[PDB]
Design an enzyme around this catalytic site. Structure first.
Site, PDB file in Angstrom:
ATOM      1  N   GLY A 167       0.862  -1.174   0.000  1.00 42.25           N
ATOM      2  CA  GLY A 167       0.000   0.000   0.000  1.00 42.25           C
ATOM      3  C   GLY A 167       0.896   1.220   0.000  1.00 42.25           C
ATOM      4  O   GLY A 167       2.109   1.083  -0.051  1.00 42.25           O
ATOM      5  N   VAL A 168       0.327   2.417   0.051  1.00 45.46           N
ATOM      6  CA  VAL A 168       1.182   3.595   0.064  1.00 45.46           C
ATOM      7  C   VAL A 168       1.293   4.190   1.466  1.00 45.46           C
ATOM      8  O   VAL A 168       0.446   3.951   2.332  1.00 45.46           O
ATOM      9  CB  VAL A 168       0.683   4.680  -0.918  1.00 45.46           C
ATOM     10  CG1 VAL A 168       0.273   4.043  -2.237  1.00 45.46           C
ATOM     11  CG2 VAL A 168      -0.470   5.464  -0.323  1.00 45.46           C
ATOM     12  N   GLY A 169       2.349   4.968   1.673  1.00 45.35           N
ATOM     13  CA  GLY A 169       2.517   5.724   2.898  1.00 45.35           C
ATOM     14  C   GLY A 169       3.848   5.521   3.594  1.00 45.35           C
ATOM     15  O   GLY A 169       4.752   4.861   3.076  1.00 45.35           O
ATOM     16  N   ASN A 170       3.926   6.130   4.774  1.00 47.11           N
ATOM     17  CA  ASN A 170       5.015   6.066   5.743  1.00 47.11           C
ATOM     18  C   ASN A 170       5.702   4.708   5.851  1.00 47.11           C
ATOM     19  O   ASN A 170       6.927   4.558   5.676  1.00 47.11           O
ATOM     20  CB  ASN A 170       4.424   6.463   7.110  1.00 47.11           C
ATOM     21  CG  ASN A 170       5.468   6.807   8.137  1.00 47.11           C
ATOM     22  OD1 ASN A 170       6.588   7.150   7.800  1.00 47.11           O
ATOM     23  ND2 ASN A 170       5.095   6.728   9.411  1.00 47.11           N
ATOM     24  N   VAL A 171       4.897   3.707   6.156  1.00 44.88           N
ATOM     25  CA  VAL A 171       5.417   2.381   6.413  1.00 44.88           C
ATOM     26  C   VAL A 171       5.939   1.732   5.132  1.00 44.88           C
ATOM     27  O   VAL A 171       7.046   1.192   5.122  1.00 44.88           O
ATOM     28  CB  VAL A 171       4.343   1.501   7.069  1.00 44.88           C
ATOM     29  CG1 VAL A 171       4.790   0.045   7.104  1.00 44.88           C
ATOM     30  CG2 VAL A 171       4.019   2.035   8.455  1.00 44.88           C
ATOM     31  N   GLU A 198      -0.594  -2.468  -7.073  1.00 44.58           N
ATOM     32  CA  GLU A 198      -1.471  -1.446  -7.650  1.00 44.58           C
ATOM     33  C   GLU A 198      -0.701  -0.242  -8.135  1.00 44.58           C
ATOM     34  O   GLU A 198      -1.139   0.445  -9.055  1.00 44.58           O
ATOM     35  CB  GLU A 198      -2.487  -0.951  -6.618  1.00 44.58           C
ATOM     36  CG  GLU A 198      -3.480  -1.963  -6.190  1.00 44.58           C
ATOM     37  CD  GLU A 198      -4.562  -1.345  -5.310  1.00 44.58           C
ATOM     38  OE1 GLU A 198      -4.377  -0.207  -4.809  1.00 44.58           O
ATOM     39  OE2 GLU A 198      -5.602  -1.993  -5.129  1.00 44.58           O
ATOM     40  N   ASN A 200     -10.995   5.695   3.642  1.00 44.51           N
ATOM     41  CA  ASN A 200     -10.855   5.719   2.190  1.00 44.51           C
ATOM     42  C   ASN A 200     -11.719   4.673   1.496  1.00 44.51           C
ATOM     43  O   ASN A 200     -12.529   5.013   0.637  1.00 44.51           O
ATOM     44  CB  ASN A 200      -9.385   5.539   1.787  1.00 44.51           C
ATOM     45  CG  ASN A 200      -8.476   6.560   2.455  1.00 44.51           C
ATOM     46  OD1 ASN A 200      -8.777   7.752   2.467  1.00 44.51           O
ATOM     47  ND2 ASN A 200      -7.372   6.089   3.031  1.00 44.51           N
ATOM     48  N   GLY A 209      -7.835  -2.292  -3.052  1.00 44.65           N
ATOM     49  CA  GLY A 209      -7.406  -3.595  -3.528  1.00 44.65           C
ATOM     50  C   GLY A 209      -6.899  -4.492  -2.417  1.00 44.65           C
ATOM     51  O   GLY A 209      -6.315  -5.536  -2.692  1.00 44.65           O
ATOM     52  N   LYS A 263      -4.120   8.306  16.981  1.00 44.76           N
ATOM     53  CA  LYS A 263      -4.527   9.543  17.644  1.00 44.76           C
ATOM     54  C   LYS A 263      -3.700   9.826  18.897  1.00 44.76           C
ATOM     55  O   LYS A 263      -4.247  10.026  19.985  1.00 44.76           O
ATOM     56  CB  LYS A 263      -6.017   9.494  17.998  1.00 44.76           C
ATOM     57  CG  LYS A 263      -6.950   9.450  16.786  1.00 44.76           C
ATOM     58  CD  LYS A 263      -7.003  10.797  16.071  1.00 44.76           C
ATOM     59  CE  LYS A 263      -7.831  10.725  14.791  1.00 44.76           C
ATOM     60  NZ  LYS A 263      -7.263  11.593  13.711  1.00 44.76           N
TER      61      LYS A 263
HETATM   62  C1  LIG Z   1      -3.516  -3.015  -2.503  1.00 44.91           C
HETATM   63  C2  LIG Z   1      -4.602  -2.058  -2.024  1.00 44.91           C
HETATM   64  C3  LIG Z   1      -4.201  -1.272  -0.813  1.00 44.91           C
HETATM   65  N1  LIG Z   1      -5.301  -0.394  -0.408  1.00 44.91           N
HETATM   66  C4  LIG Z   1      -5.749  -0.311   0.840  1.00 44.91           C
HETATM   67  O1  LIG Z   1      -5.267  -0.970   1.770  1.00 44.91           O
HETATM   68  C5  LIG Z   1      -6.896   0.645   1.063  1.00 44.91           C
HETATM   69  C6  LIG Z   1      -7.349   0.661   2.542  1.00 44.91           C
HETATM   70  N2  LIG Z   1      -6.264   1.100   3.397  1.00 44.91           N
HETATM   71  C7  LIG Z   1      -6.114   2.369   3.732  1.00 44.91           C
HETATM   72  O2  LIG Z   1      -6.876   3.265   3.352  1.00 44.91           O
HETATM   73  C8  LIG Z   1      -4.930   2.686   4.640  1.00 44.91           C
HETATM   74  O3  LIG Z   1      -3.980   1.622   4.586  1.00 44.91           O
HETATM   75  C9  LIG Z   1      -5.350   2.942   6.108  1.00 44.91           C
HETATM   76  C10 LIG Z   1      -6.082   1.720   6.674  1.00 44.91           C
HETATM   77  C11 LIG Z   1      -6.261   4.173   6.185  1.00 44.91           C
HETATM   78  C12 LIG Z   1      -4.102   3.199   6.927  1.00 44.91           C
HETATM   79  O4  LIG Z   1      -3.399   4.314   6.386  1.00 44.91           O
HETATM   80  P1  LIG Z   1      -1.846   4.442   6.707  1.00 44.91           P
HETATM   81  O5  LIG Z   1      -1.151   3.055   6.767  1.00 44.91           O
HETATM   82  O6  LIG Z   1      -1.191   5.543   5.908  1.00 44.91           O
HETATM   83  O7  LIG Z   1      -1.863   4.846   8.247  1.00 44.91           O
HETATM   84  P2  LIG Z   1      -2.053   6.169   9.113  1.00 44.91           P
HETATM   85  O8  LIG Z   1      -1.609   5.932  10.526  1.00 44.91           O
HETATM   86  O9  LIG Z   1      -1.322   7.314   8.372  1.00 44.91           O
HETATM   87  O10 LIG Z   1      -3.533   6.424   9.080  1.00 44.91           O
HETATM   88  C13 LIG Z   1      -4.456   6.971   8.086  1.00 44.91           C
HETATM   89  C14 LIG Z   1      -5.612   7.697   8.742  1.00 44.91           C
HETATM   90  O11 LIG Z   1      -6.404   6.747   9.505  1.00 44.91           O
HETATM   91  C15 LIG Z   1      -6.424   7.132  10.859  1.00 44.91           C
HETATM   92  N3  LIG Z   1      -6.403   5.919  11.677  1.00 44.91           N
HETATM   93  C16 LIG Z   1      -5.527   4.889  11.575  1.00 44.91           C
HETATM   94  N4  LIG Z   1      -5.770   3.932  12.492  1.00 44.91           N
HETATM   95  C17 LIG Z   1      -6.858   4.373  13.189  1.00 44.91           C
HETATM   96  C18 LIG Z   1      -7.591   3.856  14.267  1.00 44.91           C
HETATM   97  N5  LIG Z   1      -7.293   2.682  14.806  1.00 44.91           N
HETATM   98  N6  LIG Z   1      -8.631   4.573  14.728  1.00 44.91           N
HETATM   99  C19 LIG Z   1      -8.907   5.750  14.155  1.00 44.91           C
HETATM  100  N7  LIG Z   1      -8.281   6.348  13.158  1.00 44.91           N
HETATM  101  C20 LIG Z   1      -7.252   5.609  12.703  1.00 44.91           C
HETATM  102  C21 LIG Z   1      -5.202   8.022  11.079  1.00 44.91           C
HETATM  103  O12 LIG Z   1      -5.416   8.859  12.217  1.00 44.91           O
HETATM  104  C22 LIG Z   1      -5.229   8.780   9.752  1.00 44.91           C
HETATM  105  O13 LIG Z   1      -6.267   9.748   9.804  1.00 44.91           O
HETATM  106  P3  LIG Z   1      -6.046  11.265   9.377  1.00 44.91           P
HETATM  107  O14 LIG Z   1      -5.939  11.315   7.872  1.00 44.91           O
HETATM  108  O15 LIG Z   1      -4.773  11.792  10.065  1.00 44.91           O
HETATM  109  O16 LIG Z   1      -7.257  12.063   9.894  1.00 44.91           O
END
Ligand SMILES: CCCNC(=O)CCNC(=O)[C@H](O)C(C)(C)COP(=O)(O)OP(=O)(O)OC[C@H]1O[C@@H](n2cnc3c(N)ncnc32)[C@H](O)[C@@H]1OP(=O)(O)O
Ligand SMILES: CCCNC(=O)CCNC(=O)[C@H](O)C(C)(C)COP(=O)(O)OP(=O)(O)OC[C@H]1O[C@@H](n2cnc3c(N)ncnc32)[C@H](O)[C@@H]1OP(=O)(O)O
Ligand SMILES: [Cl-]
Ligand SMILES: [Cl-]
Ligand SMILES: [Cl-]
EC number: 2.8.3.18
Lengths: 503, 512
Positions: free
Chosen positions: B267-271, B292, B382, B386, B406
């Site tokens: 997926g995308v991002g920090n990690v 993707e 979001n 995928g 948070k």
């Molecule tokens: C091959 C297809 C890959 N596609 C996907 O996995 C799509 C679904 N996944 C996703 O949208 C993202 O992986 C996730 C699940 C949102 C996690 O995103 P990420 O790894 O960049 O993590 P990150 O810690 O930056 O969190 C993203 C947001 O979710 C929030 N968040 C993460 N875990 C949370 C939790 N347990 N409770 C509440 N909010 C949470 C986090 O605060 C951030 O919100 P803001 O934008 O700052 O308001």
């Protein structure tokens, strides 16, 4: 003579002696799928020796990996003996279920189409033993399976030692009905392309292959497969079938399905079986099955001619149906293909063929998430089986259930499912005896309107509407409105009072 | 000249005029995937006209179906205008997210690899408009896509009328990087075998195909994609990447993975960025991506040769990386394949290649069911994207997350997830900055012991252990023990007080 390879006849020995090959801690892979084709005599001898050892203060347990569910002679006997420390992937035996729900046997219900691949990966550990039931052993040493194929080819590949049970009860005319593919379906990547492009296409051979040097024992047996009969379709089941057949009719009329529909998968249970009974006199001709199992109803469809051919990994026949097909194996043999379960349940193949998936369920919540497995979220019924394989991969994913359970004391439509097996994305159509909810196109709040109005029982519908309306007003977000203080409260009410209905 | 078919030049017209072709109620399919390759000028013009109508008491909304996420010029503008009544399958725009969570835009997040098939089945209705961004139009009327392929071929097939935006910002040498197949992947059954057996394999051609008679308008544009700022790895991300790479190293040393691993999806991002930086430094060679997206960290590895090929449906680059892949498109076009998303996300292909799936999560419960989407069970982030395509089909399914969210006020490991996207059967490995839980072989109670001990934050582990211990004693069944009276109570605690951490003014069983 069932053992046609003369050399292998020298490996014949008693079930008791054979069971001694199995040691405490062993990982044992067996044949067996929906009460068909599991070993019988070696597990019984094992179970007795386990009980004796436990009494002397000796530990004696195994890990038991199967195709899917087995029978009283295997799951039943070993569970009674407290001899299984880990079980996968699917069980329907009551004694084993009790062990699982008491925490005495560890259980993981894998997607059935994935079990072979995970075994090859080593997730279950090294296979010490493969214990496989056979109809016959051919002159060149091929193992002819019995009433299922399941994972037997993979277990034979993996196991250090092989024990074969040759069961004279099984019909010699089963030889020829199976299709065992030589290719890499579940092995080390990159895997092979499986060239199945029609549900009736044979791509393999009739026998399991195994190095004879790995065969440590052959046991001559004589014992029946055992399975429960199906409930004769009642008013509830017939209503469900009627709504679904009407639905298929409309799809055909709108040219969204061919007149012969698409390859049909019918899941385990009484409701799915009643739909098939409906189809046997239905308006859709030249049907084809591409399923996990062939239940009584599908066999009935083959008999009536409405279905031309059926692919599956196993038979799941009632005692009376099982007796029927064996008297008429020459009529049915040409109408049935039994495949490895990692092929019958291959998501790639299921999507390619455009299967229609019809499956039972414990419950669904108002947004159409589905629980197939865990009552109150914690008590196992059977397992996910191949329902995920088919639901996600299918052209149309249909779930079928009475709108209530336990004589009306449980609603099968709830605010929130206590456990989820199938997410919203994996379920498009719901049918109960109250009606049919077509969710294609819909957001979660739109799904809720349809599920509540079409599928819920009148006793529970106002309560569900009340939950939903108040959730819409007070939920943290409004995309999938919930009230977390009461989302699981109907389940707790059942735990506390014996009914989901308020006093 | 970007429009090399002379006849089609006659259909060039201004964005505002093109936007008039889109009517109230229309179902509109657009290009756009991870902020790349979405149309920009026509949506802006449409939004203006929508707002003007609304001001006069006139209804004007569309159904918007995309590849995946778009950007400010599309999701943003149309959401600001309140112009979208239905949206699918995946959004990351903040204004659109607010419309969705207010119930002003209906939303369904389909599995990305399934969207084309469901569109062809008719689940979204009849497509009135396909609106697709192009790098060029070839001599025989082929449409060269830009920085993503997504669902654009399917939308072109289905739509009554087609509008093309030709964007001169996109490098001409993108032409050739795409692989578009005319085979039946998502059409009427029986479908074709998709014969991909290597991540670098091409099965199609460089262009989208469309009957020129359906092209109602072509708009000349010059505007940037949404190149999200680079997410620099923090110490939490580096710790997570460290545990994961150590795990890969061990799998290789036990011969459960080749030294070249298997095709990688992240997926995308920090990690993900930290993991890619770690791979660039690690003991692995001849890596391959089947994913993707193309991310920043890949370009350096494709450059060095550490990675041999990267397959994706889209670019997901920072401004730095996006401009660098442009100034060196002649090199990178030989190292990257952009595919239709129903092929990049095909479960059959993902399984056949044996992909390793590495995905983020909102939360997991103690038994390792995973929520990717709905905060507190009800508020969309979001979408599933995928992640289901890859988690279920992969050789190894890995979920990676900080153990808290948070600022520590939420635990990412909870008694029960408030929503489930990925069931236990679809998740084998969990990684947080606290450690790695390998769940292969384990029953749910065994999964819980590993997840609690390895992944949970020390501030929450005693509470989790207490829930589990009391559930083991009191649950209706003991296969997946729960206490339904308090399973979702940490979430309600957050809703009510802003933290999952308990007050000591009250009794809590782990305090004693
Ligand atoms: C091959 C297809 C890959 N596609 C996907 O996995 C799509 C679904 N996944 C996703 O949208 C993202 O992986 C996730 C699940 C949102 C996690 O995103 P990420 O790894 O960049 O993590 P990150 O810690 O930056 O969190 C993203 C947001 O979710 C929030 N968040 C993460 N875990 C949370 C939790 N347990 N409770 C509440 N909010 C949470 C986090 O605060 C951030 O919100 P803001 O934008 O700052 O308001
Ligand atoms: C291609 C793979 C297909 N495989 C699968 O779908 C495996 C998972 N599915 C299953 O195990 C079955 O389809 C199900 C979910 C048990 C439904 O079975 P079925 O259609 O025969 O349903 P039926 O209404 O007869 O109920 C079967 C049992 O489940 C119980 N049950 C069903 N719904 C229930 C609910 N909402 N709450 C509690 N118990 C419920 C029912 O009481 C009965 O148990 P008992 O005989 O009383 O001990
Ligand atoms: Cl849909
Ligand atoms: Cl394929
Ligand atoms: Cl596993």
């Amino acid at each position: 003579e069932r053992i046609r390879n003369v050399a292998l006849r020298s490996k014949v020995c008693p079930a008791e002696t054979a069971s001694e090959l199995i040691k405490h801690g062993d990982v044992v892979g067996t044949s067996g799928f929906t009460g068909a084709g599991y070993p019988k005599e070696v597990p019984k001898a094992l179970a007795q020796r386990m009980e004796a050892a436990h009494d002397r203060g000796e530990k004696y347990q195994i890990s038991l990996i199967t195709g899917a569910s087995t029978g009283p002679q295997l799951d039943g006997e070993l569970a009674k003996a407290n001899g299984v420390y880990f079980r996968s992937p699917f069980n329907t035996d009551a004694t084993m279920r009790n062990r699982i729900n008491a925490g005495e046997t560890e259980y993981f219900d894998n997607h059935l189409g994935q079990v072979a691949g995970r075994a090859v990966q080593g997730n279950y550990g090294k296979f010490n033993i493969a214990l496989v039931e056979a109809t016959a052993i051919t002159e060149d040493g091929g193992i002819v399976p019995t009433s299922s194929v399941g994972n037997s080819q993979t277990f034979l590949n993996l196991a250090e030692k092989v024990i074969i049970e040759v069961n004279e009860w099984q019909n010699p005319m089963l030889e020829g009905i199976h299709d065992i593919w030589d290719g890499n379906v579940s092995g080390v990547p990159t895997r092979d392309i499986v060239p199945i492009v029609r549900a009736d296409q044979r791509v393999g051979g009739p026998v399991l292959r195994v190095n004879p040097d790995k065969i440590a024992a052959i046991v001559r047996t004589n014992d029946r497969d055992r399975n429960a009969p199906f409930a004769a379709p009642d008013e509830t089941a017939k209503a469900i079938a009627g709504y679904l057949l009407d639905f298929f009719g409309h799809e055909v009329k709108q040219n969204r399905l061919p007149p012969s529909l698409l390859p049909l998968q019918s899941g385990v249970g009484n409701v799915a079986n009643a739909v098939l009974e409906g189809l046997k006199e239905g308006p859709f001709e030249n049907l084809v099955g591409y399923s996990e199992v062939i239940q009584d109803g599908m066999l009935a469809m083959l008999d009536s001619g409405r279905m031309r051919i059926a692919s599956a990994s196993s038979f799941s026949l009632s005692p009376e149906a099982a007796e029927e097909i064996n008297n008429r194996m020459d009529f049915f043999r040409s109408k049935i293909i039994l495949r490895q379960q990692d092929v019958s349940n291959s998501p790639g193949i299921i999507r390619r063929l455009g299967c229609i998936a019809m499956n039972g369920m414990i419950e669904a919540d108002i947004y159409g998430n589905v629980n197939s497995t865990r009552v109150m979220g914690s008590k196992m019924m059977n397992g996910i089986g191949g329902s995920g394989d088919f639901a996600r991969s299918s052209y149309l994913s249909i779930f079928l259930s009475p709108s209530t359970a336990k004589g009306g004391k449980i609603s099968a439509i709830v605010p929130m499912a206590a456990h989820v097996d199938h997410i919203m994305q994996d379920a498009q159509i719901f049918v109960t005896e109250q009606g049919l909810a077509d969710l294609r196109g819909l957001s979660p709040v739109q799904r809720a309107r349809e599920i509540i109005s079409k599928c819920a029982h009148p006793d529970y519908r106002p309560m569900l509407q009340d939950y939903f309306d108040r959730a819409l007003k007070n939920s943290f977000g409004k995309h999938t409105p919930h009230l977390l203080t009461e989302a699981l409260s109907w389940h707790q009410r059942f735990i506390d009072t014996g009914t989901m209905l308020p006093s």
